[PDB]
Amino acid sequence: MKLYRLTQKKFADTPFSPIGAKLFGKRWNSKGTEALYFSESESLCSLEVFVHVNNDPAITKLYDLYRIEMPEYLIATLDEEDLPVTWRAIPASESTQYIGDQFLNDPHPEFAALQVPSTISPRDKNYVVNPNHPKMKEIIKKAEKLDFAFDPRIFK
């Protein structure tokens, strides 16, 4: 699977540091838990961030896009029944926080990523990756830096 991440250019020296997730992540993780956020496509990856800054049509100039290949055998899938009703609330529910935390702080990690539904479009899936997984460094070595082709003028 091809997964897309983006971060500001200032972080180019450490693009896949779980620090942003630890210090500021609220949806699929709580403070102190290490995590990485990827998306199935460049467009969903771009929307998740740029919707909050949709007034700027040149936001892409502050950011850098990266892509990885995640083996299918270490991608896990959640179930809607385990998902609560408030999972899509803007004040992020602690339930999603703790599902993600359980996946991310889990010792003896068999799977490296968890498929979660996007808050913007639940039928399109984001992926939360545990950096503490063994077979991740290699994936980070094979990562490719892309130029943005998504058009931010969509937000007019």
Partner: protein, 127 residues
């Protein structure tokens, strides 16, 4: 890492912000006294009384002003442009449930929410 010689940021809030701070903020953020009251919950009469008598703002008022100034700083760090930072401060944000960032400096809870949003945007974390 201290502003002036000993003011810094912590000592400044308890010592009391001088009215020059309010003047510089209202010129930079381009908001009226009513809009300043709306964002900081500081009464308009209180602002006038501080300005005329050359009285510094008290510590809770200075803490309110500090949250707003920290929003300005973090947003300018986000966009690397003060103008875009202001546009976004006055812009409704999907991650704030439809509230603009200016409406998120009245308390400390909203301020923490907006700070974490800014951090996520910097590091490309999904909200």
């Amino acid at each position: 890492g201290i502003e002036d010689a000993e003011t810094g940021r912590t000592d400044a809030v308890h010592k009391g912000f001088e009215p020059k701070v309010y003047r510089n903020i209202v010129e930079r953020v381009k908001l009226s006294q009513n809009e300043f009251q709306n964002v900081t919950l500081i009464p308009v009469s209180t602002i006038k009384r501080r300005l005329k008598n050359d009285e510094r703002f008290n510590t809770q008022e200075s803490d309110a002003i500090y949250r707003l100034a920290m929003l300005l700083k973090l947003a300018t760090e986000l966009f690397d442009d003060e103008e875009r930072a202001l546009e976004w401060m006055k812009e409704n944000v999907y991650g704030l449930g439809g509230k603009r960032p200016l409406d998120m400096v009245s308390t400390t809870v909203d301020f923490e929410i907006v700070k974490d949003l800014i951090g996520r945007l910097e590091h490309g974390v999904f909200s």
